[PDB]
Symmetry: T
Subunit: 67 residues, 12 copies
């Protein structure tokens, strides 16, 4: 009946984990419709002078295909 597609995005943020996830989802929303669920695959990031520099949440986003 219904068919969904999953797309793997990496959301990044210097503020936090929630912000990194939201960054990815805010970009998906600009282009994709019927965004339904997400799955966090891994949490990575870079290290700077002040500790964590950039949080990087690797993310699978599922959306319903039209037509």
């Amino acid at each position: 009946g219904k068919v969904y597609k999953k797309v793997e995005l990496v959301g990044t943020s210097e503020e936090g984990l929630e912000a990194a996830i939201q960054a990815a989802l805010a970009r998906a929303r600009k282009t994709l419709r019927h965004l339904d669920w997400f799955e966090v695959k891994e949490i990575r990031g870079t290290i700077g002078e002040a500790g964590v520099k950039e949080y990087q949440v690797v993310l699978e986003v599922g959306f319903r295909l039209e037509e």
Copy 2:
């Protein structure tokens, strides 16, 4: 030489597992050419009053890239 792409789809069906897989592949065939193989990643679904409500087969579909 050849390069293939894999795309992750979720086929759903109220009838059965085979029907769920076929639903995903029937939607892929509308848009993609040179579909070659698939790999079932996981089997999930929803529960209703009569037991299984919707079978949901998470699926990787491999196809040959042109040019």
Copy 3:
């Protein structure tokens, strides 16, 4: 806000995979309320004289906790 619980069941059937899943969900329904989704963890079984004897679907069942 909401909290769900997951419970690991193994549904068995001599007839097929769908029947094995349905057996587990039919038993869960007798006792548990607000059954929402399931996840197939593995498919196993026994072998007899006529091939497959019993299909055994190891299954995670998610339901909403009350109150």
Copy 4:
């Protein structure tokens, strides 16, 4: 000597990841005694108009069995 049990819960929250984990543990505390440790199995969630709608932390909770 001692025997512990592990139970798989899914804590949900619209506010954040920490709130989702706390939701699950607050519900466990109402019913279970000698809660000791937890293990995050996966982080999932739903998508709405404003990005993340509901954070969902799938969680294993370990507690000491009495007697």
Copy 5:
């Protein structure tokens, strides 16, 4: 005391998943004795014009070694 061996087979069928599993077990029975249990490792297949062309169930078969 007892020692079992596991052998990895791939059963294929154009008709369905159950038929693929049965194809592997029917071939094992021709040659091996004391076949006891099986474990499905992965589900793959090929794609044709009519959707799924051949279902391919990768399968571990366990049997008791004699003597």
Copy 6:
């Protein structure tokens, strides 16, 4: 037909691995009926002055559900 449930326990012992497994199964037997099989998921433990202090075997226990 039949439906089984799996429950995740952690047996602990200062004496050894076998004693840790037996501790979990001895506690299960007090409360659960038709215990059939177990699966070791992981082996952990604590460290003291004399080496290993407590062996901790994380364990899945499968039993047949009644009625």
Copy 7:
């Protein structure tokens, strides 16, 4: 801030593993901009009369999304 996308390709070559990876990346470069990193997921291949016939490197390619 930044958002990356990951795409799963399978590079193939009769010459070697490096050539298979390079095949996939050369095809990505024709169409995608800001290609940054790759991750080898698995190495497979076909067998002919002279041993290995075609090396097949399944590959995840990460690139920065524009705008």
Copy 8:
């Protein structure tokens, strides 16, 4: 140069884990030559009136192929 083969066996014993492993290796030694190393894949078993009934160590055994 050298080629090794791996074979998956399941050693069982009512006495203990070490005895289960040794049961598998004692049977391998009767038939196979140049046995070099082993890898424990999982530890399972059955449950009886007195706790553990039979320990079952699933095992990969590596040996050098002749010629």
Copy 9:
């Protein structure tokens, strides 16, 4: 050319996940130079009377080796 080393740390914090990661990286920075990236392996923790007591992020830290 370049060689990096990875070290596995567990950062802990009573405040949150981000604080737990930062605690680990702040300790690494005291002793190690050329810290570049991190990978979260798992998220665990302890439970107290107020829910989560201590967040524990198991973490791999990668840094470039000198000379």
Copy 10:
């Protein structure tokens, strides 16, 4: 319909990874018919005075069963 068997071999070579894989397949070819595909499970090896001493590619080889 068709049934395939998978066999786990370890090909070794002092010259390189491709040579290690080819060593395994060249030995399989001597004894087995209808060799079709392979899957690299892991890459290991030994260390000597001059760096890598022996590359060791653990390999699954799939072939069609006759008759």
Copy 11:
């Protein structure tokens, strides 16, 4: 607050599994302070004329870092 380090050791013994684990922890204790917990990653070993020759337990050891 607190930061722990994990180190991966392989304890070996001809006597048994418990002895292999203890061998690793006895060596760690000579050099490292505040050893707290361990995690068994895998169980391997070598094969001789009399069956198992050497048990080899690959082990992660966690200890609290000072100051």
Copy 12:
């Protein structure tokens, strides 16, 4: 009896995979004694204008502890 330690290194090279592994092992040899075996955990790398820029082999190196 014997105790080994494992250390996780990432060897990099612009020339190839073998060169990346050798880079890691050549650096280990400068400082560590009784290097015995290695295990490749993952293969990653960076992308430049000419395809692959730097191969990066994440590697576990095992060596016998002295004394």
